[PDB]
Structure formats: C-alpha cells, structure tokens
Amino acid sequence: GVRKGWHEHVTQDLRSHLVHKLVQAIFPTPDPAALKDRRMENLVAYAKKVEGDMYESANSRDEYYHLLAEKIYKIQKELEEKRRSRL
Amino acid sequence: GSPGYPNGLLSGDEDFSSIADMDFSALLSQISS
Known part of the structure; x- marks a missing residue:
C-alpha cells in the first residue's frame, strides 16, 4: 500500500473534528x-x-x-421524510 | 476483478436510520422536559 498526503496530514485532533462534523449534521x-x-x-x-x-x-x-x-447529506434525507410526509 | 465490494446490504446504512429517528426525539425531550 502506497501512502499519500492525507495519511501524513490526518491527526488525532482531526478525527475528533470529523466526528464533531458528523454529530452536528x-x-x-x-x-x-x-x-x-x-x-x-x-x-x-x-x-x-x-x-x-x-x-x-x-x-x-x-x-x-x-x-x-x-x-452527512444522506442522514439529512431521513429527517426530511418525517418532516414533509411524517413517515 | 471486483474494485472492493463493501460488506453490509439493507442492514449497512439502513439499520441506524431506525435509531436516528428514535434518538432525535429523545434529544428534544431532554432539553425542554
């Protein structure tokens, strides 16, 4: 497996903001x-x-x-199914 | 042959969608009571 820029760019502090980016959506x-x-x-x-x-x-x-x-956009779809059609 | 083939069909991303409408109603009831 070849390593790219993301591998040396992703931190332990990013992975927490990626999940905080997920919980807010x-x-x-x-x-x-x-x-x-x-x-x-x-x-x-x-x-x-x-x-x-x-x-x-x-x-x-x-x-x-x-x-x-x-x-993040795909979970926003299901919350919209309860909003317009309530199902 | 095969680019990857992920595991989880109809129960991969459709399984938490039942919990995410159960958890959204519990998060509103805990702030207003």
Missing part, C-alpha cells in the same frame, strides 16, 4: 452540555466507527472527507 447542538449526554454518545459510537472505513477505502483527501460528507 445528525443533530445540531443547543447547549455544549448535550455532548456529555447518554443518548448523544450512542450515535457518537456510530460516527466513531465510520472514520476507519474511510481509511481503508479512500486513497485521497478529497475522497476520504467525501465519504464522511455523503452520510
């Missing part, structure tokens, strides 16, 4: 105290898992950040 935060809640940590465990699937699948910085971004 799924549910926007009213208060900074909602991030220390039990029900919130449950989908945090959904978003903590996905980043590692982008590391094996993506070979570029534009694809890696895109795979995490596509779930």
Whole structure:
C-alpha cells in the first residue's frame, strides 16, 4: 500500500473534528452540555466507527472527507421524510 | 476483478436510520422536559 498526503496530514485532533462534523449534521447542538449526554454518545459510537472505513477505502483527501460528507447529506434525507410526509 | 465490494446490504446504512429517528426525539425531550 502506497501512502499519500492525507495519511501524513490526518491527526488525532482531526478525527475528533470529523466526528464533531458528523454529530452536528445528525443533530445540531443547543447547549455544549448535550455532548456529555447518554443518548448523544450512542450515535457518537456510530460516527466513531465510520472514520476507519474511510481509511481503508479512500486513497485521497478529497475522497476520504467525501465519504464522511455523503452520510452527512444522506442522514439529512431521513429527517426530511418525517418532516414533509411524517413517515 | 471486483474494485472492493463493501460488506453490509439493507442492514449497512439502513439499520441506524431506525435509531436516528428514535434518538432525535429523545434529544428534544431532554432539553425542554
């Protein structure tokens, strides 16, 4: 496996902002105290898992950040199904 | 042969969609009560 720019560019501080980028699209935060809640940590465990699937699948910085971004627009679809049709 | 072939069909990205409408109602009820 050949290493590209993203591999030496991704930090332990990015992977936390990538998940904080994921939790804000799924549910926007009213208060900074909602991030220390039990029900919130449950989908945090959904978003903590996905980043590692982008590391094996993506070979570029534009694809890696895109795979995490596509779930972000794709989860925005289901919340819209309860909004207009309520189903 | 085969570019990758991901694992998880109908239960890969469709399984948390049942939990994400269960967790969105619990996050609103905990702030307003």
